Swiss-Prot record:
Organism superkingdom: Eukaryota
Family from the record: Belongs to the FKBP-type PPIase family.
Localisation: Cytoplasm; Nucleus
Organism, as annotated: Plasmodium falciparum (isolate 3D7)
Domain remarks: The PPIase FKBP-type domain contributes to the chaperone activity. Required for the inhibition of calcineurin phosphatase activity.
Sequence ranges assigned to domain PPIase FKBP-type in this UniProt record: 31-120
Assembly behavior: Homodimer. Interacts (via TPR repeats) with HSP90 (probably via MEEVD motif).
Function: Has peptidylprolyl isomerase (PPIase) and co-chaperone activities. Assists protein folding by catalyzing the peptidyl conversion of cis and trans rotamers of the prolyl amide bond of protein substrates. Inhibits calcineurin phosphatase activity in vitro. Plays an essential role in merozoite egress from host erythrocytes.
Covered residues, full protein: 7 to 127 of 304
Protein's name according to its UniProt entry: Peptidyl-prolyl cis-trans isomerase FKBP35
């Protein structure tokens, strides 16, 4: 077991559910295209609001390019290939006071289960 606080203020806490592959080559780097599966829920209601499994299409994004909420860049950059984790993301590292669409209210704490399937360096 291993629970990790990724930010001094505790706005991002990652609980490892399954350790990944050993090796620095198994750690995604900034700018890399990352591929994951995820399940997201609101801590307030505990109900799942979205998941890549609804469509069965892994989610791909580029690490630390401002493409995803800050909490995600922080959490994924600390994961190893094939790692499964649960991450608690407070509004500050989520959608803040603005919220997102009508699915995520402002000042919402978010809970995500993320599985790092793979990643690749570009150029
Ligand atoms: C506009 C084009 C649609 C385009 C949608 C897709 C490619 C499909 C892709 C599976 C997203 C899902 O589509 C069903 C769906 O995923 C959510 O349900 C969700 O679980 C979530 O929170 N995610 C998705 C997984 C990564 C973390 C976070 C996110 O970062 O999402 C990202 C996000 C909004 C980042 C902003 C970027 C600007 C920052 O300023 C802001 O921060 C202030 C954060 C998404 C991926 C955007 O980069 C791209 C898009 O939005 C959102 C609740 C609503 C979102 O649909 C909209």
């Amino acid at each position: 077991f291993e629970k990790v606080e990724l930010t001094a203020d505790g706005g991002v806490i990652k609980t490892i559910l399954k350790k990944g592959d050993e090796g620095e080559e198994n750690i995604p780097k900034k700018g890399n295209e990352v591929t994951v599966h995820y399940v997201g829920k609101l801590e307030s209601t505990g109900k799942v609001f979205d998941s890549s499994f609804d469509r069965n299409v892994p989610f791909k994004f580029h690490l630390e390019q401002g493409e995803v909420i800050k909490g995600w860049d922080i959490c994924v950059s600390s994961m190893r290939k094939n790692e499964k984790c649960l991450v608690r993301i407070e509004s500050m590292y989520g959608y803040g006071d603005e919220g997102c669409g009508e699915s995520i209210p402002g000042n919402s704490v978010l809970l995500f289960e993320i599985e790092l399937l793979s990643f690749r360096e570009l150029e």
